[PDB]
Ligand binder design. Structure first.
Ligand code: CLA
Ligand code: CLA
Ligand code: CLA
Ligand code: CLA
Ligand code: CLA
Ligand code: CLA
Ligand code: CLA
Ligand code: CLA
Ligand code: LHG
Ligand code: PQN
Ligand code: SF4
Ligand code: SF4
Ligand code: SF4
Ligand code: FES
Lengths: 158, 99, 58, 745, 80, 38, 73, 130
């Protein structure tokens, strides 16, 4: 569906479950049970099995080479593969993009602003930090207040 | 803005004045505010014409870019980046004295 | 004009359409009779400049 | 006279140990103490961190900054040595390695299983999992004779407390008690204690460790005793008669040494030479004999120079009396040169400790010192190559400060007609005859490699330079190997075995794996040594041009007035791009990598073809690459096909294995190498105008910094393309060498 | 055969003549600022174009432009 | 002041924040490995 | 094939990036406001004002043939 | 204006066959100082008048600038020796250093506008101007 087959029921994807643990069990049969290198392999056996049960219940969409694939055609059924990772990404990318701008206005209204960019005012840098989970309803208000963008006849230009 | 006194003297012309300055104001700006002409080029610390010699006192001359380490070891201060942090007496017209 | 900040209008300088800070306006018929200082230093490491009286807008 | 003027002259409490100059950085210079108006200030904060001559003209407080900073360097060595001995204790298989060191791989790193990175911990035997490791401490700890796991845990906590003394000593010599310049200019006494009480006692007490500990341990290890069943190192000291059951000379005692019956100590201080076929390495009784041989005449060479008590060769007087007819005034003036400027002293010290470490790399592979390092071909490859590159890097620094001294501390008023002045006077004939011989060598070394490549391409194989062709037999290098096989018996009559098995004699093989085979120098080594003679000559062509044209040239007659490290003197005179003595080091560092990569490629193909491999109990020898250096080494396609393309197959067919970390570094340092050429081919004025677009994109958004975001400066821009190139020129040779020999061997 | 013409900003900051190692810059008294001097360039045929005036030139942008045109054995700096 | 104001220099105030913000990504890969989604 | 067209579209935009810089900054900038009076192919502006290697629009052309061969490669 | 005198040195890095331009930097000293020749080496500097033949004018100025800073003497004169034998008296140009302001004003290569006020190169088409 949506092109290729789901990997919830895929023989090549289930073969990649098979020969990987068959490769990894061949390392297990040269040790003895009870040693700490034995427990390091058998714990690494189950984290590959549960990984292969994570992608089965996740509903990833791939076939013909036994891999998982991802769909970025804006699909709301496939929103867990790209969209809500990006929606948490673009959330507090916009922290650091906004509080770096918020830090760089109160530092300009100082005595010596050149030293203060590498010698931090940590009560002001943390003082402008935690107003960053609520950026874009204030940044859009900043966009329509007017002073987010200076006028073109006062910028540095060639 | 504190208060400081600089006794300037040019013996080639023969003018001895006592000017008053602050911590942010330059020395020749206080000389122009008392009506004393002094040689200068662009007020940057990057020429040689505005050179004075510190006879007595203590001068923050650190914002200049023309004079090197040894040439300021004899006490040659450009009067346009100088923050006078003490009560001083300065010989001026030392533009040929640095080189 | 003494004192306060004066914006520039001439091109070919580092400080174009910047804030400016005027000092000691000259009266001798010199072509560039203001020796206006700046912050945000240029490529030469010189934070000051002199230009003419035709580029003030204050 | 200096009859009481060798004394200590110490200031008490010079600098208050405070915090206000500790957090206001750039505090060592007038041009950096007034804040970052530009972003040149951040890159000048790191470049002027150790440029102490640009901080103060007072040589007394320059030399106190040197002596305290060495203690900070020496504390880093003891902290790093504590990391090696502690990872031998808690994170190792060394105690399992001593029961069978012929097939158990070394391991000193257990990776945390976090991101699925646990596949790098390979099955290296011993009931233990971990990263296969190749610095070779395991054969060092068998050479010193550390048996159990407790002694590695005690040395690293004995080494950490040696760092905490050494870090405290630099604190004491800058903040409580600092010496003066009278103390540092007593160089006739410093060479006394360094020859005698540093290297002599460094040998003689180490000869005490080898005879009393490492010889009874390594006489009982190779017999077949388990390391739990060997008596302790403090049982070979308090029990003299237990040593008597190994060497019968210890039943006598100290009376042969005191009464000079020194031939009674021949049973444990021998002159065997060669190898030890039981344990795979040097005879340890020879090494125990070698150290107190150096000790009893380093301390003899310690008392050479003039001291407080009258006697001694004065260093000012032996230099002054070496005048001659060609050499003008001789060395009149050089003693005041070397006891004023550290850069003059660093320029001689770096060429020596550089080119002693190249002697270390060559006197280790063909004479394997440590037991059971002979079978471990990964440790021989990594201990060769690492001692090359340190000797390759520290030799270009000898012409760094050889040129920094000339622009800073060379006064020509003190150097009239002496030996340093006379080569500035005839500096055309130095470089031009060096300029001729590089074109002579590179036509006669690299031009033959084209000439064998064309003749193989043109079909006519009888017109190249090979064994079955016009032979270029290296008859000088084939002769000295026939001398050292007559060095037993004939020329050094008390040496029983050979001086080294690389010149000839017999094979030595340990548990089937070949310890050392005789290297047969053939006609493919006449050319590759002439490659090595060519690219060494080009590195001294750039660097000696950097020293002799450091003051002035016919391009620039006042080059020293602009400084050492400056970009240019304008595009006039046709263009003066890369004209400083900094850029001669920057150009000379590149040909060092273009030199030393060939030396380790000559190492990694000849020793993979002629000495290493396997030995059948009939005596049949089968090498790794089959001995393809006789034919395929003579052409540049053969260096591409049979060596570069063929031996990298173990690197790139190594995913899913424990060597898969090396394949990531093998692609890591292709990337950083082709990150260098952005910094290297381009200029500055492009990027500064490209940054000029981005400052518009921030000043539109009230986002511009109060500091000025600038492009990197031109010497700074050449330096970042230099260091990227030498990470990506070395790191992929690192990741191909280690991934090949661990896989195939 | 360069062309090192000096513009009208030209404050008489007498260091371009100092930084010139070929004496092709020369101060000329001229009606203007408080320094009352301008920098003149008589020896354009004698210059090398090594741009040593422009590095010590604290105007708005470069009172002494340098712009390199023609050339000879003097300007190319050969000792043979 | 002046020792905690030494811990406001941009590398060292960066690095103890970079020790934090690296290890935030490390320890969420401890408890939730192998994540292509959510 | 999804990822490798983005390797092309990296090189399509970057070779555009040097040359739309190379077109539009032939005339002037802040580093050199009188670049038009010097010409298309001049060496540099010297080491002054920070240093000015590869400032010309010819040297702004020069970097893209590296990126063109990187892109079509 | 020239005269036969000496300089006093030894050297092996100097002018080649050169017959288009040479000179003589001639000056009077005060002591037997030791100075760097700008092509390299050292010399002995006899206390009267002494001269130096070198190749090209950068070496001649950088010896005249080195003589002004260390052991300060404002009396160095610079000629130019042609292959035919003519002299020039190049450097001070009338008895004084050019950092001092003259009374003889030539005033050439002095454009009377700002550096932005320069025409476009379309306006200088197939002729020679800025
Ligand atoms: C030009 C490429 C492009 C772009 C910019 C978007 C953009 C978007 N798509 Mg989308 N989409 C694309 C191609 C694209 N899609 C393709 C090729 C298909 C298959 C026909 C779809 C089918 C699709 C669906 C079914 C949905 C989106 C949705 C969305 C929105 C989230 C976002 C505006 C969602 C939405 O709300 O938009 C209708 C949604 O539910 N997309
Ligand atoms: C205050 C931080 C800050 C902010 C808000 C921006 C914002 C922006 N930059 Mg930018 N930049 C920054 C720092 C910042 N930059 C730094 C430090 C550098 C030097 C490495 C650059 C180099 C740079 C380039 C080269 C370019 C931009 C571009 C852009 C624009 C597009 C977004 C983008 O791709 O970002 C780009 C982001 C990066 C390349 C990496 C981020 C840099 C660091 C990690 C962020 C600073 C974090 C800092 C610690 C925050 C302080 C807060 C607190 C600790 C007090 C946007 C206006 C592009 C542009 O012009 O588009 C219009 C562009 O081409 N930036
Ligand atoms: C037991 C043998 C022995 C003997 C006979 C000497 C004898 C001497 N040493 Mg000596 N030395 C010895 C062992 C010995 N040392 C050891 C074991 C070391 C440490 C490795 C040194 C390190 C040493 C130094 C560093 C110096 C001497 C110096 C001297 C000379 C003057 C010392 C004195 O008393 O006045 C004298 C010739 C001093 C001298 O002037 O050397 C010629 C001197 O500076 N010695
Ligand atoms: C026999 C005595 C002796 C010894 C062992 C040393 C040893 C050393 N000196 Mg030293 N020195 C000595 C006498 C001695 N010096 C004298 C008499 C003078 C004055 C003329 C100097 C002047 C001098 C200078 C100017 C410098 C050294 C440096 C060094 C170090 C070189 C690094 C090295 O080779 O790695 C080998 C390293 C080791 C073997 C590490 C172990 C070191 C242990 C702790 C022994 C140290 C002995 C020490 C002299 C005892 C001081 C007494 C104190 C406890 C009160 C090394 C630690 C250089 C250095 O690194 O500075 C620190 C340096 O810059 N020394
Ligand atoms: C410098 C280091 C050093 C130290 C601390 C010692 C210390 C000692 N040696 Mg010794 N020794 C050394 C070097 C050293 N030796 C060297 C270089 C040789 C070879 C010439 C010897 C040869 C030697 C013999 C032959 C004997 C000792 C013995 C002894 C012990 C009693 C005396 C004592 C522990 C004796 C012993 O075994 O202990 C009683 C003994 O018989 N030593
Ligand atoms: C005995 C060792 C030694 C010592 C004490 C010095 C000391 C000095 N050198 Mg020097 N030098 C040396 C060896 C040494 N050098 C060698 C071996 C070379 C040839 C490679 C040079 C080449 C050299 C040049 C070309 C210059 C100096 C300069 C200096 C001075 C200041 C250095 C400074 O502040 O750097 C501060 C420290 C750094 C900038 C560290 C940078 C780290 C580099 C990039 C290596 C990092 C790679 C890393 C280890 C591995 C990969 C990391 C990973 C992230 C990929 C100082 C006098 C400079 C100077 O001004 O002289 C007066 C100068 O111009 N040296
Ligand atoms: C593989 C690339 C390469 C090559 C071949 C060269 C070549 C050379 N470099 Mg070089 N160099 C390079 C990259 C290269 N460079 C890089 C990347 C850098 C920057 C780090 C430098 C930096 C550099 C410096 C700093 C120096 C050199 C020097 C030299 C010369 C060494 C003498 C020699 O062997 O000449 C012999 C020429 C060859 C071996 C080239 C091959 C010619 C073959 C053998 C035969 C000719 C073909 C054909 C028969 C000719 C006739 C036909 C033709 C007319 C059509 C030589 C011209 C040195 C120099 O100029 O003085 C000697 C020197 O000091 N190089
Ligand atoms: C493989 C070598 C290589 C690489 C990676 C780059 C990378 C880049 N070049 Mg570049 N370049 C190269 C060779 C290279 N160049 C060569 C040979 C030339 C010819 C001289 C040029 C000429 C050139 C020009 C002329 C231009 C570029 C531009 C760019 C940027 C493109 C934007 C981009 O991809 O953003 C992503 C950035 C990268 C891919 C760079 C690598 C980033 C790494 C992988 C991540 C950060 C490092 C990370 C923190 C690792 C830890 C480091 C550790 C020490 C802590 C980027 C910085 C353009 C530019 O700057 O526009 C903005 C531009 O105009 N380059
Ligand atoms: C070392 C060989 C140099 C020959 C010096 C011959 C010799 O005896 O010189 C000795 C001579 C100095 O002798 P003096 O008579 O001046 O002795 C006084 C001084 O030695 C003491 O102050 O040095 C020179 O002539 C300088 C030019 C040497 C030319 C160096 C050429 C280097 C290339 C040759 C290297 C070959 C190495 C491999 C050989 C297979
Ligand atoms: C790309 C390039 C530049 C531009 C490169 C720049 C401006 C470097 C930008 C990267 C710096 C190193 C970022 C530093 C940011 C700090 C690490 C802070 C980041 C925030 C946290 C990591 C703490 C040059 O200046 C240059 C100069 C000369 C020849 C070639 C080139 C060249 O190729
Ligand atoms: S350099 Fe600029 S400022 Fe100094 S004199 Fe020549 S023109 Fe006037
Ligand atoms: S042109 Fe070259 S020489 Fe003439 S002044 Fe400018 S820099 Fe000095
Ligand atoms: S920067 Fe590069 S190009 Fe511009 S002058 Fe200095 S060297 Fe010549
Ligand atoms: S007057 Fe020009 S620098 Fe002060």
């Amino acid at each position: 569906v949506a092109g290729l087959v789901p990997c919830k029921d895929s023989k090549e994807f289930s073969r990649r479950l098979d020969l990987s643990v068959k490769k990894l069990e061949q390392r297990l049969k040269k040790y003895e049970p009870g040693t700490p290198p034995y427990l390091a392999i058998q714990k690494s056996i189950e984290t590959t099995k549960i990984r292969f049960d994570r992608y089965a219940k996740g509903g990833l969409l791939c076939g013909k080479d036994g891999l998982p694939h991802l769909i970025t055609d804006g699909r709301l059924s496939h929103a867990t593969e790209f969209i809500i990772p990006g929606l948490l990404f673009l959330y507090i990318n916009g922290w650091i993009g906004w509080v770096g701008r918020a830090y760089l206005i109160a530092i300009r209204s100082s005595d010596k602003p050149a030293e203060k960019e590498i010698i931090l005012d940590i009560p002001l840098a943390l003082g402008f930090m935690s107003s960053g989970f609520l950026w874009p309803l204030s940044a859009w208000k900043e966009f329509t207040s007017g002073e987010l963008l200076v006028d073109a006849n006062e910028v540095t230009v060639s | 803005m504190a208060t400081y006194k600089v006794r300037l003297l040019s013996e080639a012309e023969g003018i001895d004045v006592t000017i008053d300055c602050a911590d942010d104001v330059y020395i020749l700006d206080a000389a122009e505010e008392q009506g004393v002409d002094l040689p200068y080029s662009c007020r940057a610390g990057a020429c040689s014409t505005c050179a004075g010699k510190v006879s007595e006192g203590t001068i923050d001359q650190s914002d200049q870019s023309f004079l090197d380490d040894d040439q300021t070891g004899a006490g040659f201060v450009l009067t346009c980046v100088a923050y006078p942090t003490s009560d001083c007496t300065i010989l001026t017209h030392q533009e040929e004295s640095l080189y | 004009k003494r004192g306060s900040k004066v914006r520039v209008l001439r091109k070919e300088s580092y400080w174009y359409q910047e804030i400016g800070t005027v000092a000691t306006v000259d009266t001798s018929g010199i072509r560039y009779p203001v020796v206006v200082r700046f912050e945000k230093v240029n490529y030469s490491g010189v934070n000051t400049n002199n230009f003419a009286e035709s580029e003030l807008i204050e | 006279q200096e009859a009481k003027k060798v004394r200590i002259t110490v200031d008490k409490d010079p600098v208050e140990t405070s915090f206000e100059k500790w957090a206001k950085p750039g505090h060592f210079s007038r041009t950096l103490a007034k804040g970052p108006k530009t972003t040149t200030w951040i890159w000048n904060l790191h470049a002027d961190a150790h440029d102490f001559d640009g901080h103060t003209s007072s040589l007394e407080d320059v030399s106190r900054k040197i002596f305290s900073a060495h203690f900070g360097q020496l504390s880093v060595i003891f902290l790093w040595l504590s990391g090696m001995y502690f990872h031998g204790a808690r994170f190792s298989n060394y105690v399992a390695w001593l029961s069978n060191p012929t097939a158990i791989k070394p391991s000193a790193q257990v990776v945390w299983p976090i991101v699925g990175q646990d596949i790098l911990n390979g099955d290296v035997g011993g009931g233990f999992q971990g990263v296969q490791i190749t610095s070779g401490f395991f054969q060092l700890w068998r050479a010193s004779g550390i048996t159990n796991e407790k002694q590695l845990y005690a040395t690293a906590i004995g080494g950490l407390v040696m760092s905490a003394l050494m870090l405290f000593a630099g604190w004491f010599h800058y903040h409580k008690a600092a010496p003066k310049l009278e103390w540092f200019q007593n160089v006739e006494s410093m060479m006394n204690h360094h020859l005698a009480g540093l290297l002599g006692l460094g040998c003689l007490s180490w000869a005490g460790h080898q005879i009393h500990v490492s010889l009874p341990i390594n006489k009982l290890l190779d017999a077949g005793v388990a390391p739990s069943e060997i008596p302790l190192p403090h049982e070979f000291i308090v029990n003299r008669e237990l040593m008597a059951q190994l060497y019968p000379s210890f039943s006598k005692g100290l009376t042969p040494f005191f009464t000079l019956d020194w031939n009674a100590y021949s049973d444990f201080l021998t002159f065997k030479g060669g190898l030890n076929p039981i344990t795979g390495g040097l005879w340890l009784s020879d090494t125990a004999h070698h150290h107190l041989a150096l000790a009893v005449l380093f301390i003899v060479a310690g008392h050479m120079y003039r001291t407080n008590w009258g006697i001694g060769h004065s260093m000012k007087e032996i230099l002054e009396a070496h005048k001659g007819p060609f050499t003008g005034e001789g060395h009149k003036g050089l003693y005041e040169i070397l006891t004023t400027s550290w850069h003059a002293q660093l320029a001689i010290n770096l060429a020596m400790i550089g080119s002693l470490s190249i002697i270390v790399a060559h006197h280790m592979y063909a004479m394997p010192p440590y037991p059971y390092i002979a079978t471990d071909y990964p440790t021989q490859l990594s201990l060769f190559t690492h001692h090359m590159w340190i000797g390759g890097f520290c030799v270009t620094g000898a012409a760094a400060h050889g040129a920094i001294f000339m622009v800073r501390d060379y006064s020509p008023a003190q150097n009239y007609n002496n030996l340093l002045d006379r080569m500035i006077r005839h500096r055309d004939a130095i470089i031009s005859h060096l300029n001729w011989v590089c074109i002579f060598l590179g036509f006669h070394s690299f031009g033959l490699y084209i000439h064998n490549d064309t003749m193989r391409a043109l079909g006519r194989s009888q017109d190249m330079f090979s064994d079955t062709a016009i032979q270029l037999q290296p008859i000088f290098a084939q002769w000295i190997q026939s001398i050292h096989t007559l060095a037993p018996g004939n020329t050094a009559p008390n040496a029983l075995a050979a001086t080294s098995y690389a010149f000839g004699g017999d094979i030595v093989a340990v548990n089937g794996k070949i310890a050392m085979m005789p290297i047969a120098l053939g006609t493919a080594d006449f050319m590759v040594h002439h490659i090595h003679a060519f690219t060494i000559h080009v590195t001294v062509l750039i660097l000696l041009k950097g020293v002799l044209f450091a003051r002035n040239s016919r391009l620039i007659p006042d080059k020293a007035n602009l400084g050492f490290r400056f970009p240019c003197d304008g595009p006039g005179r046709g263009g003066t791009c890369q004209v400083s003595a900094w850029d001669h080091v920057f150009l000379g560092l590149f040909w060092m990598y273009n030199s030393l990569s060939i030396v380790i490629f000559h190492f990694s193909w000849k020793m993979q073809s002629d000495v290493w491999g396997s030995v059948t109990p009939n005596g049949a020898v089968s090498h790794i690459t089959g001995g393809n250096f006789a034919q395929s080494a003579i052409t540049i396609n053969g260096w591409l096909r049979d060596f570069l393309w063929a031996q990298a197959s173990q690197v790139i067919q190594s995913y899913g294995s424990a060597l898969s970390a090396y394949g990531l570094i093998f692609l890591g340092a292709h990337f950083v190498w082709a990150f260098s050429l952005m910094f290297l081919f381009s200029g500055r004025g492009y990027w500064q105008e490209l940054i000029e677009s981005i400052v518009w994109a921030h000043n539109k958004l009230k986002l511009g910094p109060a500091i000025q975001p600038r492009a990197l400066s031109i010497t700074q821009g050449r330096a970042v393309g230099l260091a990227h190139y030498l990470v990506g020129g070395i790191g992929t040779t690192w990741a191909f060498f280690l991934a090949r020999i661990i896989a195939v061997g | 055969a360069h062309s090192v013409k000096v513009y009208d900003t030209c404050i008489g900051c007498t260091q371009c003549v100092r930084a010139c190692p070929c004496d092709v810059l020369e101060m000329v008294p001229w009606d203007g600022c408080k320094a009352k001097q301008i920098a003149s360039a008589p020896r354009t045929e004698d210059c090398i174009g090594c741009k040593r005036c422009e590095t010590a030139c604290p105007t708005d942008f470069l009172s002494v432009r340098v712009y390199l045109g023609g050339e000879t054995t003097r300007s190319l700096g050969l000792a043979y | 002041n002046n020792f905690l104001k030494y811990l406001s220099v941009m590398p060292v105030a960066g690095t103890i924040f970079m020790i934090f913000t690296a290890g935030l990504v490390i320890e969420v890969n401890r408890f939730y490995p192998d994540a292509l989604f959510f | 094939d999804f990822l490798v067209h983005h390797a092309i579209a990296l090189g399509l935009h970057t070779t555009a990036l040097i040359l739309i810089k190379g077109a539009l900054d032939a005339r002037g900038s802040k580093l050199m406001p009188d670049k038009k009076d010097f010409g298309y192919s001049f060496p540099c502006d010297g080491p002054g004002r920070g240093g000015t290697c590869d400032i010309s629009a010819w040297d702004a052309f020069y970097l893209s043939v590296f990126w063109m061969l990187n892109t079509i490669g | 204006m020239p005269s036969p005198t000496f300089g006093g040195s030894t050297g092996g890095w100097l002018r080649a066959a050169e017959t288009e331009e040479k000179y003589a930097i001639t000056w009077t000293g005060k002591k037997e100082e030791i100075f760097e020749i700008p092509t390299g080496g050292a010399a002995i500097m006899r206390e009267g008048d002494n001269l130096l033949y070198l190749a090209r004018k950068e070496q001649c100025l950088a010896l005249g600038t080195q003589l002004r800073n260390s052991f300060k003497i404002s009396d160095y004169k610079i000629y130019r020796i042609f292959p035919t034998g003519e002299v020039q008296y190049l450097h001070p140009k009338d008895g004084v250093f050019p950092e001092k302001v003259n009374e003889g004003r030539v005033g050439i290569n002095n454009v009377s506008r700002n550096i932005g006020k320069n025409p476009n190169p379309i306006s200088v088409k197939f002729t020679g101007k800025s």
